[PDB]
Point group: D2
Chain length 498, copies 4
């Protein structure tokens, strides 16, 4: 015997030992007489159009591939449940939270960011940690990361940021000039760059890292009272990281280390779990916060805003077909049931648009009809119709305009959004010159210890040394702005590379 | 009360009188608070990206339309059954025929040819009569027409023929120069042009016309003995046609006359039926036939090849959602179960390719997973995987290569194609100068009577008069080649138009 | 000789009188030996896969069709120029207006609304009148209609409204219950319904109707001073309408009457023109307007806001290929150069999203690279890359992230949008019960004469007669709310139908 | 200074040293005032739909990705010329060969087979070596590999074979059970498996490997005399391979080693070249060949069929934009000019269908209009029209049906394919049990030396060790069938792994 992942086919056969293999058919259900030899006129004669077995199979093979995710292309999935353990009904009326012990099925997808479908799991990169809750009030997608923060605080910078990470448009190589030119010109990135080049930049698989919603969200209770919140889901397996040496080895030795580790853990009954927490910030406290509390480069200090337990996320089922159940998984931040709403975070506001938009491209207009995407715990009833690959009854003969006198679906006032007041000029407000260094200094000096600071500066120097000197100089000036010794440490390492 | 079609919504509501309307949701299953008013900052303020109710609905509205059929875009559908009444098991082992009284569910789509989705039902044109049989051995699509013959006998002419019927590439108008230049240069078209401009060119709805497979097909019995066949399905309601005057009136008065007539007939229990017949031609008789028995411009004379009854086609169910169940219907001539095979008919050989190819474009790579297209009476099991909008389990964890040692699906030798011998040069053989006039003369002189001949020549002159004189002259020469008086009749009518 | 449109092929032939027809090739540029006869093994043998001439041609034929526009599917196009005749530079700094005599190339598409690509030109429906200005500051799309108003004033009603105007989802038939249920429940539609059932409901082709921007827009001058405006383009050929009897006859006699009329006018040098006017309203005037000045169901009365001449629209060029140049035309209201900006009109805000969104579906991600859609009179330079059917150099090796230190394109502060102040709650504010009757009363009593009132009420009664009595009753109540005699006139006509 | 590839941005900047960077615009050509800050109501307010700069950019970003190639996803491209050096006009009339010194522009793409777009260059796998010749008789695509043979000889095994080489459908991991189960069941793979696990399994970049057409093709001269041929293009830089240890290190150290090496060679003027040879075999020689001369698992021995020089392939131009020029490159084996034709090779016949088919999916219906795919050195003239993303005049107002009387393009009889005779039954003829061992014995014993045999058996044992024992046993039996010591060598290595 090997690992469970290695014995996938052996176990499939054993489960089906007395199955009596199925008859091999065309897509049209016609049985096939011989799928090993093409139809020709004589043994050394030409192939015929009449070989509809060959073209049925080859035309489908020719169409197997769909566009990979524009980002987080490389990933691993599992299914399980969310279990409420504690009462947050004073903050949120959302059905998902409504009583202790209540279970909601989830889907989870873990990923890297920059690498395309064939890249390695054990590389330095943020990790996607996306959770789909199939609630009675529809799907709630909490599209999280293994960091509470990000590199930028306006969505207009996002395409550029990703371009700067991904391949040179001429050469198709990774380009340290592109990476550090962008980061040196945009020092709001200093906080997450500091997280990224620390030890938690290369987690030991998906089970040994935390998840965060990252953004400020809004919770609304049964009285229509709102608070702002952050979602934290902490690993029950504990934080564990790979050394740059071990990460490098696994990169060529098992590019799919993360996939394999998650599958085997679930197959052997070593089910991974996380505790979901919220931080709560009053509208009054949001006015007094010394930063923009909607700035994605900032955390809420735990001292001032302690973690409040909510429940348990448990992954206890592997995918049966990876393409159907994982590759086709679509998470939309805009999928929020009553009791959960967006904040004015400029990055989050951008995501409300981007995810359903890319899903209509990558998957198709009717992507929400793919079974893993279906809000299967809710009754979908509305005035939407048709589109390519329309899958179910398309809501039959139901009146397709609103309003109508013919008893078709009706809106539900209790689901109305929470009323928040705004005043100001309609303008592109500059956010570039908000505090870029303060929280990063507390991380560098207080959170990490000496050996972590040393590895951090070695990790950055190791990559930054490949950029031109003028980029190296601008970068070091940013690290110096957080703390003189953070800068001078990097600069000394840079000096003996150059 | 009105007609049943007119009371569609009234009956939907009455059926749902005590329904308790559904809650209106987003595609993601989230309930909607107010779907009549957009989210703005103040009553006369700008629209927000945060209005995910608006963009969910509008993005789907923006994607409602799919490409219309390249031909037969305008159509009507119904469902019912095929019932075997007579034994043809000496000719075909196909499960669909296997015992008297055996029922197979069918889908039917009726159509015009040239008109796009918004065109009129009661125009002069051939009619599509496509029948999908959901058999235990997969789907059998008999993609028929209301004529036993066609305009051409090689598929290389088909795109040109259709272009010549459809709009001028600059003007976007119907173009009599294009119509008659093609037909005058390709006199193999004389037979079906003669059928088309007769009274049966404008049927009174879909229920008062016959269906034909048109092509020669092959039937194979349980002994591996083959014969050639033709499929005929004759209306139990009787042949009935609209006068050019009545067809013209209904064109602006009810462009959807055919849709309305079929729906109302089924809704009132006036279920339309056809008797399915075969003609049988031995391989020996195929050698002695005075024409190419695979030439789509030719019939098998009933005298020499009498109709052999098979069973009954009955339409007893309307579509519930037209887009899902009709617009998305996909018929592939290549869908043939064991016991039914193609002939060497050059036109049919072309269709084996064209239909699955256009369906992968119009509908999508996984179009056979659309419920109305599913071979739902067969177990589909094979080595095909993935592709866009992959709908079911994608055959789970089943071994995805053949051959394999892991008990995945196996081919079934009894399904092997019938062995036929061919000898010759691989060449583009000229079929243009086969007999173009003989069977057309017997139609003009023997099948039609005097008043039918007169209307026929009036119908042609009425349209041909708009072509340039040199086209008129070439056309008349072809009609003269079938019979001098067929030509001179047209030419006299032409003379007093010009 | 016939009309110029009829002689399209004749003229094309003559114009290459030197001849030497081109060599017939595959898409790959390989010359074709015989495209009239398929490659078979012997003359009555099977078709070979080796016939790559057949597959190349048939596969392209199989893919000819793209989704038709979700609305305004049925249309006519022509090209020409815009010429400035008056100085409006005190209102708008837009380069398009910057000096008298300045010419800008334009593209124009005329259409109906509800009908599909095969429907008739001469039906009762609003008419699209979309104008693309190819300016030095990029494309300006003025996506106008032959009416200054519309049926609804919130984009969330738009898909519903269009659903109600198109086919029953089960029957696929036009449904007077759907039409009048929606209109009777939404009496904001009374104004444009009154415009629609008046004489200007069926214009005599596209040359004899006016165009309107319809929406309030914003004009911004070189001093950053803003005003609100409305665009009017009045026909220089004069208003002319078809009687319902004449329109009905042309429906079946020439479904493409509009296409034919526009092509022939331009072909014979009878170039149609329009005079472009603006109305101007101050921010202060907007605060005092007795209605919402951004409500699409209202006009600015000419007495209070007189037309200000700007310039001339001239169509002097027919399309050469209709699919490439017209079917593929894409107008985005969001295409606005500096000097022209959106107003808070709920409907316009909706359209800023919908058109680029539907274009990415109907045409493709890179639709703006289709030559007729290309802003060919501007330099397109940005950080956008790749996508399906990327057709130009994809901006070559240019740095693909912003900001950068490598000389890639730079934002231009003079292009910054005009700053306006807003205060309010984020809420769905109800606009259903704004004034629905006042301006409609003045239209019925002042603008129309007796004979026009009578035809108006006949035109409504003639359609509304087929709706259920409860819908007839509610509709009549709304017409009664505008004026008792408008209601009683319709009710008397209805009474002798029922 | 670094390598030229590293300095791509630096060089781009310098080359426009005059500066005046372009104005940043939307896709619509509208200039952008600030693309760094989103449009909000106040600085901590919500994002507006009015921010059409954000939506234009983000919607294009959302649509960057297209499906990767179903095989050979990971690749490098360059451009140059083909120069004729010898007269082969006695064998082929193809314009490409017609006189010595004649130059043809070429495009070339190198690739691995199984890996996705993010996988490493320096892995064991065959290498694609595809060459596009832009000839006056259209494009000639010679879609070759770095091997003269392949693993299978019938196209019906191809999707299965590729499935077996890629990821487990449940696990998404490489699966040695899938690899060796398929290879052990299909011993026709022994020859190319022997080539693959030899030293030439991991070439030192793309410049140090040979190209082969692999298939038997047909050459036809001006007299209509045909011969069978094989194309060989031998590296002028010499064969050079990476050790498994070195290839392993470069896998994680530079996953893009191949891309980097080709770009740098061309950038520094070290242009790589290949010498094109043919082998020629008579129709009479084909009848006497001791194997099937069309069997893709066999070579023509050089002793019996010596290489005949033809000309020189030179790569002297790097891509400027990789997505536009390389990712979008499409090679169709069916692109063959007069003088070059397919043989009855079952595998080649399969490829005549598969490539245009996958290109219509991956790229679009009109992929041949993508500039790098355009047969720009030929006039494309035919009766093909329309389709999505139609980019040129769509052949303007040219008559669109054939035949026509209006001077549209004409077929050219000199282009007619060569006529060959076939006799036989239409059947699926078994090719599984053709000689699987003879030529592989000569390769193992004659072509390789002792040290090479030892590395070969180490390379196989090193992979096969992870397959189940029953698969190990069947594989060893096949290697034993070629020579007992080939088998026992592998079995000894296997024994000390197990
Ligand atoms: C029946 C056998 C085969 C089938 C069905 C087949 C099919 C395919 C398909 C579908 C692609 C993807 C093409 C694209 O997306 O652009 C591909 C790529 C490729 N195939 Fe094959 N293939 C076969 C055999 C071979 C053989 C025998 C060779 C070489 C002798 C070969 C060389 C290639 C190359 C080089 C590419 C990549 C071309 C590029 O760089 O764009 N294939 N093949």
């Amino acid at each position: 015997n090997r690992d469970p992942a290695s014995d996938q086919m052996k176990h499939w056969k054993e489960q089906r030992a007395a199955q009596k293999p199925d008859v091999l058919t065309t897509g049209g259900g016609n049985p096939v007489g011989d799928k090993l030899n093409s139809l020709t006129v004589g043994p050394r004669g030409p192939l015929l159009v009449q070989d509809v077995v060959f073209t049925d199979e080859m035309a489908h093979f020719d169409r197997e591939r769909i566009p990979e995710r524009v980002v987080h292309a490389k990933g691993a999935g599992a299914f399980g449940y969310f279990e409420v353990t504690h009462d947050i009904t004073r903050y949120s009326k959302a059905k998902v939270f409504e009583h202790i012990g209540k279970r909601t099925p989830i889907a989870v997808r873990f990923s890297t960011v920059a690498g395309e479908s064939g890249s390695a799991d054990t590389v330095r990169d943020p990790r996607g940690f996306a959770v789909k809750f199939y609630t009675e009030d529809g799907n709630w997608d909490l599209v999280g990361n293994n960091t509470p923060i990000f590199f930028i605080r306006d969505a207009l910078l996002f395409p550029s940021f990703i371009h700067s990470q991904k391949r040179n448009p001429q050469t198709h190589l990774k380009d340290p000039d592109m990476v550090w030119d962008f980061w040196s010109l945009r020092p709001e990135s200093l906080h997450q760059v500091s997280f990224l080049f620390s030890d938690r930049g290369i987690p030991d698989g998906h089970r040994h890292m935390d998840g965060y919603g990252s953004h400020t969200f809004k919770l609304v209770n049964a009285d229509g009272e709102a608070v702002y919140c952050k979602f934290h889901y902490k690993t029950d397996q504990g934080i564990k990281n790979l050394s740059v040496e071990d990460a490098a080895r696994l990169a060529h030795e098992d590019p799919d280390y993360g996939l394999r580790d998650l599958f085997n853990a679930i197959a052997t009954g070593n089910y991974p779990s996380w505790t979901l927490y919220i931080q709560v910030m009053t509208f009054s406290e949001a006015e007094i916060f010394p930063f923009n509390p909607f700035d994605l480069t900032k955390v809420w200090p735990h001292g001032d805003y302690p973690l409040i337990p909510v429940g348990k996320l448990v992954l206890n089922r592997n995918p049966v077909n990876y393409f159907a159940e994982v590759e086709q998984l679509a998470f939309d931040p805009s999928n929020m049931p009553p009791g959960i709403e967006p904040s004015p975070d400029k990055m989050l506001q951008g995501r409300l648009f981007a995810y359903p938009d890319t899903h209509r491209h990558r998957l198709g207009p009717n992507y929400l009809q793919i079974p893993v995407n279906c809000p299967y715990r809710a009754r979908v009833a509305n005035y939407q119709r048709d589109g390519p690959m329309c899958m179910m009854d398309n809501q039959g003969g139901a009146p397709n305009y609103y309003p109508n006198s013919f008893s078709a679906p009706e809106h539900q006032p209790s689901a109305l959004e929470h009323r928040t007041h705004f005043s100001g000029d309609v303008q592109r407000f500059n956010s570039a010159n908000d505090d870029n260094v303060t929280q990063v200094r507390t991380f560098y000096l207080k959170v990490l210890n000496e050996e972590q600071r040393k590895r951090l500066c070695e990790n950055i120097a190791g990559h930054l040394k490949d950029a031109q000197l003028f980029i190296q100089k601008k970068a070091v000036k940013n690290f110096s702005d957080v703390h003189p010794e953070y800068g001078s440490r990097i600069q000394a390492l840079l000096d003996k590379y150059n």
